[PDB]
């Protein structure tokens, strides 16, 4: 018997089986509707301090492999699923899910009513919780930890995941045929982009390289100054965990960049930041956007995209300065999804154009960024 238990702040208990590391895990609980891509999800830094619940019952069907790691590690605090398959069945698999979780010392539970969990989260909203895996997990104690959890609202997690030192990235996208390409030389990549690491996913980088971009990944707290000193063709603001708001250092820099004519594009957190930096306000979502089937409309072109989401906070459009134009909107709830500055070469998108996992539908987003860059390199 390998017991595990999950308790939410409200006392709701979920008894099941331990599939990961023995221990306890605490964080804000979320549900992701994605049918595939659990690994990518696990390793996405945006999940820092979050207990990820997956709605699709069978998780680990294809085991795991390195190409499917969206970062150096698993950032989810915990993992909650209904069923851990008896085996992984896929030619790309290098390690079954249990072993991999244990390997990354992640506390995980299976065998629980994940749909009950999902509906609770949807109706009452996000809730903090704790998982205890081990001999006789103490529910009172799980309740305690779940209650002690400080909450993600007002929490700057970007500074927590960011890179100590700045590095270069010159590797592109994986291919069935070739797999993950070798890192390119610098004289190959035409442009130079500076990407602020706020818990950046490998994919966005790769996708940037793909479009001729040589990258310089700088710590989250990098100053505009030392940035403007690199003669950046463009400036990128990565996705990342927690509240964007408490990120003063980012807002300041960004505001500085925006005094410039250098092009700026941000995704997810980056997007939020850019909005905050422009005088826009951010809000915490009841339950957030976590799935890979999110319809997003490009209001300009009147077209729809299926997109990958992963955000607990959003930009209040009713607080949008008049310099920020609404480019995209969620077809599910009406929430703001993309913005462009009427005065500067700055645009951002809430969803994940890089996907991984998910529909490739918002990839063309990168393109406008590149356009701007080429144009910047014009003048």
């Amino acid at each position: 018997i390998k017991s595990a238990l999950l308790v939410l702040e409200d006392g709701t208990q979920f008894h099941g089986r331990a599939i990961g590391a023995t221990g306890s895990a605490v964080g804000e609980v979320v549900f992701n509707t994605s049918m595939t891509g659990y690994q990518e999800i696990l390793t996405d830094p945006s999940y820092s301090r979050q207990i990820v619940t997956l709605t699709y019952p069978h998780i680990g069907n294809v085991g795991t492999n390195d190409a499917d790691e969206e970062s150096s590690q698993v950032h989810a605090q915990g993992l909650v699923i209904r069923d851990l398959p008896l085996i992984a069945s896929n030619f790309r698999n290098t390690e079954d899910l249990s072993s991999y979780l244990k390997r990354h010392n992640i506390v995980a539970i299976a065998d629980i009513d994940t749909r009950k969990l999902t509906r609770l989260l949807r109706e009452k909203g996000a809730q903090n919780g704790c998982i205890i895996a081990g001999d006789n997990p103490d529910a009172a104690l799980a309740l305690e930890k779940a209650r002690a959890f400080p909450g993600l609202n007002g929490m700057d997690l970007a500074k927590e995941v960011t890179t100590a030192e700045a590095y270069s990235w010159t590797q592109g996208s994986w291919t069935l045929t070739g797999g993950l390409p070798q890192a390119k030389k610098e004289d190959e990549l035409p442009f130079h982009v500076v990407a602020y690491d706020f818990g950046a996913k490998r994919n966005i980088l790769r996708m940037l390289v793909d479009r001729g971009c040589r990258l310089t990944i700088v710590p989250a707290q990098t100053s505009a100054e030392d940035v403007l000193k690199m003669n950046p063709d463009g400036i990128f603001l990565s996705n990342g965990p927690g509240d964007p708001a408490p990120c003063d250092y980012a807002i300041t820099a960004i505001q500085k960049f925006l005094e410039t004519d250098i092009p700026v594009f941000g995704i997810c957190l980056g997007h939020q930041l850019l909005a905050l930096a422009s005088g826009a306000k951010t809000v915490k979502m009841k339950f957030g956007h976590h799935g890979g089937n999110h319809p997003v409309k490009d209001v300009e072109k009147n077209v729809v995209m299926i997109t990958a989401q992963n955000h607990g906070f959003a930009v209040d459009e009713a607080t949008l300065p008049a310099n920020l134009r609404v480019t995209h909107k969620s077809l599910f709830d009406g929430t703001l999804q993309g913005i462009h500055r009427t005065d500067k070469p700055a645009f951002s998108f809430q969803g994940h154009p890089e996907a991984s996992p998910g529909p490739h539908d918002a990839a063309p987003l990168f393109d406008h960024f590149i356009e701007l860059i080429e144009q910047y390199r014009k003048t």
Partner: protein
């Protein structure tokens, strides 16, 4: 973007009669397309020869045509109705093909009819195999190595390049029709010949084998604004090589990584774009090499399908509904998602928090000499679907809802059989309809997963789960009921284990296992389908059972509920006809204010559509499943009479367990159903019945037989001619009955409320008694029976209604011999002819009877008089012989038909002509007829030859038949039997000398020797009649013109006094 102003009216092409590979899925879809366009203010016109459809119900469209699906016939509908547009994607292959004929024939131009949904060019790009493959080249997708062939010589060249085994697939066909896998030149030749001639464009695509690769399907939807969504992904359990329609399949895909999935998804979209589908749905098929993920595109179907219907059921997203709207200009963003109460658009990709499993239903036992191995040509007759929270649960539930008597992984082979492993091995290596079961048995016998993988090519992801269930079963047998502690029981229940399966393993009654669960507070909870994995609330009650924590049933307290039990998967003799009835009970009662609850698991029908009832429990129709629903709903009544055999067989047990079965009681039913009980009733009432007995031993037979007199009906029904003939049976081989030779069979459908009896319809079959009613063409009104004789029947039915205490529907079968009425059988429930009668008579018998069952008298309804329409209505069937070539295409006491058609005319001959053409008959009004009848028909055949000569037919005849003709002044050209010389009948058939054949036979021997005539006629598409009555009917039809006039159902109905 919004609806189209240039289009006021729309013609929707129906699918026609139910056939293997093209079934009930088209009524579900067609019904949805009608519903959707009618909600939008569009004029709806549609054509469907199949009367047993909800889509042909009068109130569902403006102008409904139950006429043969022939271009010339449609043309008459166009002419008359003048449709602005035509939607050809809702009716299977039949609609695609008709649409293109009408194009080709210039009818679309003639009448300025616009083709919506899919264009003729898109359709062809997809259906023409050459074109599709070229299309792939264009978009950079890969296809297996293949070659086109328009001739047999072309075909062998291709076989030589790709090698054996090779796969053959004709252009313009689906469901694997005309195709197959060839392992040798012999099979190559037989299949290529069949495909060549069955293909509407006479072309075959021949491919290298990808047998064993994984098989996937995706359902795609696209709008005019180019928005594109994947509605559902499907992973086949059975690998490449077994048609998807004959395979077990699951949703969503399970073994693809996200990276692979996106490649697949993207490919899917590129396919649609390239083929040219911009306003509607399409299914894309692929093959994936498990070893390296190599993706190969297989085909694409530019219309709704059996997968789109399964996809809709699986996800809760109504594809057909949405596609209809999309054909009239709507876009996905503008349409609202039904099951999330419209708070979300249709522009999204569903997400499911459960596992959906489909298992095909077969009927091999009906076609004994047929090859029973699964291949690329579909052979299944229906399908079951189940929803579970895990694959295991999903799979066992589906097995128990299959209506094959399984309770899950029931063993097929005993552990102590020394050759057991050999049989198992054969069954795994070359799959039959029972493979699933053999898989568990291999594990019971010690075969490893790898061992099984190697033989079946079934992904180990699935195999391991089956192996696990086996080990669990092993444990239950070991510990018994004693070891079934609350914790273990819960575990087993959560794996799908049926109480019956557990009782069997543990050696106790199922009821004891059921009681045990109550003890431990172990009842399932119900979860809801919502298309979004609980992301959004739903106001819909579409549920499935599961062993989890929270329940979403939330049964109302407020109202009066009526539950309707469906029949599960379709099978021969258990068709869409019962489902129509079920639907009708629910629509009527709901309209009446009752809250209705449908219990069914067939994904192809309207009964399982969420709009059909207040509450839908998509579950196995079993005692266990139903009991759990009643437990929580506490309905006022439960209808057991409309779903066919399935529910019928549960009535006694339901009642026993305390269910409020309304309508005709389970004992009353059994009274009828019971041979003993019955034979008594018949006497009591002083009614005529064939002479019968119940023999145990042979020699008791001969005697009893000598006494009842031959011919005899031996209840696998055979007709034994003589004593010598009986042993013959006896050996090869109990109810014994005197066969009523040269008798007119009749079907009477009626309603009894305890107060009165309403005669629904009196139907005279064309084929005589001895040819199953289910396979007989029939007439309404009767075309030869005397008012007098019929009045007798009428009275005889009324007598039986009261006697058995019928409450609702009933059907009585008679035989009229020598102006004398005899009783064949009483079916105190809804019969398969109901929808036919309803359509012919405009009276909705299933609705009336439902009300009656619920408590509204006939009186009360204003339904008291029997309706004799002014016109003639004829029903004809479609037989699946072409799908099992090795079978003798001959009629008999056992039912084998899959579907039916309706013909309406001013004369019986007109109606019969319409039935005939609607049934896909190849009969012509010229040429040469072949007459080869038996003794008893020789005399009567004279008049038939006269008729034909009179219609301009030349005549050929076999020796004996020519003799008698000659003796009556008719000199046919003689033909040799095969043993007689050359050329013989077969050479002539093969050589196209005949346009029509009449071949009647008697005797096991005789039949066996004449087999070549019938197999030949079938193979060569020559219209043939195996009964003189059929002959006479066909002869009359010759004086009719099935294309002359058309009439709508509404028009039919108004014409009624």
């Amino acid at each position: 973007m919004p609806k189209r102003t240039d289009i006021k009216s729309i013609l929707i092409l129906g699918a026609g009669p139910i056939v293997i590979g093209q079934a009930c899925e088209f009524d579900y879809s067609g019904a949805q397309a009608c519903k959707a366009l009618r909600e939008e203010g569009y004029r709806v016109i549609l054509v469907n020869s199949n009367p047993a459809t909800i889509m042909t119900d009068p109130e569902m469209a403006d102008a409904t045509y139950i006429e043969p699906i022939h271009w010339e016939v449609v043309r008459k509908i166009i002419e008359k109705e003048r449709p602005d547009a035509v939607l050809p994607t809702m009716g299977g292959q039949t609609a695609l093909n008709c649409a293109l004929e009408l194009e080709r024939q210039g009818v679309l131009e003639e009448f300025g009819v616009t083709m919506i949904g899919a264009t003729a060019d898109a359709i062809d790009k997809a259906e023409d195999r050459r074109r599709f493959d070229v299309a792939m080249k264009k978009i950079g997708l890969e296809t297996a190595r293949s070659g086109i062939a328009h001739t047999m010589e072309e075909a062998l060249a291709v076989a030589a390049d790709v090698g054996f085994p090779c796969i053959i697939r004709p252009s313009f066909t689906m469901g694997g029709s005309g195709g197959g896998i060839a392992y040798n030149r012999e099979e190559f030749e037989e299949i290529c010949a069949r495909g060549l001639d069955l293909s509407p464009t006479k072309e075959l695509l021949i491919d290298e084998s990808l047998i064993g690769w994984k098989e996937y399907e995706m359902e795609v939807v696209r709008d005019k604004n180019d928005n594109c969504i994947i509605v559902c992904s499907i992973e086949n359990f059975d690998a490449m090589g077994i048609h998807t329609g004959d395979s077990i399949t699951v949703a969503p895909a399970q073994t693809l990584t996200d990276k692979e999935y996106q490649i697949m998804r993207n490919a899917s979209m590129a396919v649609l774009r390239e083929i040219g589908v911009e306003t509607g749905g399409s299914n894309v098929q692929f093959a994936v090499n498990p070893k390296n993920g190599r993706l190969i595109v297989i085909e694409m179907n530019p219309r709704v399908s059996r997968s789109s219907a399964l996809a809709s059921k699986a996800t809760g997203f109504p594809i057909a509904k949405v596609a209809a709207k999309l054909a009239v200009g709507y876009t996905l963003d503008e349409l609202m998602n039904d099951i999330t109460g419209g708070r979300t658009p249709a522009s999204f990709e569903p997400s499911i928090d459960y596992v959906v499993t489909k298992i095909p239903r077969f009927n091999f036992e009906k076609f004994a000499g047929a090859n029973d191995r699964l291949t690329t040509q579909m052979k299944s007759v229906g399908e079951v679907m189940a929803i579970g929270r895990t694959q295991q649960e999903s799979l066992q539930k589906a097995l128990r809802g299959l209506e094959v008597g399984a309770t899950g992984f029931d063993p097929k082979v005993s552990l102590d059989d020394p050759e057991a492993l050999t049989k198992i091995r054969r069954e795994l290596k070359d799959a039959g309809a029972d493979r699933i079961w053999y898989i568990a048995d291999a594990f019971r016998a010690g075969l490893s997963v790898d061992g099984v993988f190697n033989l079946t090519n079934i992904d180990r992801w699935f195999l391991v789960q089956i192996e696990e269930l086996v080990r669990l079963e092993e444990k239950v047998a070991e510990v018994g009921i004693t070891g079934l502690n609350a914790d273990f029981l819960r575990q087993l229940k959560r794996k799908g284990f049926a109480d019956a399966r557990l009782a069997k393993l543990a050696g106790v009654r199922e009821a004891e296992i059921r009681k045990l669960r109550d003890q431990y507070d172990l009842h399932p909870v119900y979860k809801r389908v919502d298309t979004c994995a609980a992301e959004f609330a739903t106001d819909t009650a579409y549920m499935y059972s599961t062993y989890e924590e929270e329940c979403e049933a939330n049964p109302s307290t407020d109202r009066e509920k009526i539950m309707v039990l469906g029949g599960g998967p379709n099978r021969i003799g258990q068709g869409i006809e019962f489902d129509y009835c079920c639907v009708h009970a629910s629509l009527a009662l709901r309209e009446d204010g009752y809250e209705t609850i449908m219990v069914n698991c067939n994904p192809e029908t309207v009964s399982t559509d969420y709009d059909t009832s207040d509450r839908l429990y998509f579950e196995p129709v079993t005692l266990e499943d139903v009991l759990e629903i009643v437990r929580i709903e506490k309905p006022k009544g439960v209808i057991v009479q409309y779903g066919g055999q399935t529910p019928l067989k549960l009535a006694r047990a339901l009642e026993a367990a305390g269910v409020p079965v309304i309508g005709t009681s389970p004992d009353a039913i059994d009274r009828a159903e019971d041979r003993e009980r019955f034979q008594h009733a018949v006497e009591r009432l002083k009614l005529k019945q064939p002479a019968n007995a119940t023999v145990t031993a042979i020699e008791m037979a001969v005697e009893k037989a000598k006494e009842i007199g031959y011919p005899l009906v031996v209840r696998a029904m055979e007709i034994v001619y003589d004593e010598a003939d009986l042993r013959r049976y006896f050996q090869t081989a109990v109810l014994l009955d005197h066969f009523l030779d040269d008798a007119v069979e009749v079907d009477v459908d009626a309603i009894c409320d305890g107060e009165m009896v309403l005669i629904g319809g009196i139907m005279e079959h064309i084929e005589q008694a001895g040819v199953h009613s289910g396979d007989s063409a029939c007439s309404l009104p009767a075309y030869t029976l005397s008012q007098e004789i019929q009045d007798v029947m009428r009275q005889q039915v009324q007598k039986l209604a009261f006697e058995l205490q019928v409450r609702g529907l009933m059907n009585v079968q008679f035989a009229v011999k020598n102006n004398e009425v005899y009783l064949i059988e009483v079916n105190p429930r809804a019969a398969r002819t109901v929808p036919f009668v309803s359509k012919a008579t405009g009276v909705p018998l299933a609705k009336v009877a439902a009300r009656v069952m619920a408590g509204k008298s006939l009186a009360e309804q204003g339904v008291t008089k029997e309706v004799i329409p002014p016109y003639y209505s004829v029903k004809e069937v479609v037989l699946p012989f072409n799908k099992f070539p090795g079978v003798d295409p001959l009629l008999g006491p056992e039912m084998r038909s899959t579907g039916e058609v309706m013909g309406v005319g001013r004369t019986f001959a007109e109606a019969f002509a319409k039935a005939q053409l609607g049934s896909n008959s190849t009969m012509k009004k010229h040429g040469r007829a072949l007459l080869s009848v038996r003794e008893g028909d020789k005399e009567r055949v004279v008049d038939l030859a006269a008729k034909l000569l009179k219609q301009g037919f030349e005549l050929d005849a076999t020796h004996g038949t020519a003799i008698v003709l000659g003796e009556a002044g008719i000199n046919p050209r003689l033909v040799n039997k095969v043993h007689e010389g050359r050329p013989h009948i077969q050479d002539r058939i093969k050589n196209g000398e005949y346009t029509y054949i009449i071949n009647t036979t008697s005797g096991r021997r005789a039949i066996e020797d004449s087999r070549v005539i019938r197999r030949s006629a079938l193979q060569y598409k020559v219209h043939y009649d195996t009964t003189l009555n059929g002959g006479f009917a066909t002869a009359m039809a010759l004086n009719a013109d099935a294309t002359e006039k058309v009439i709508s159902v509404q028009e039919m109905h108004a014409q009624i006094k």
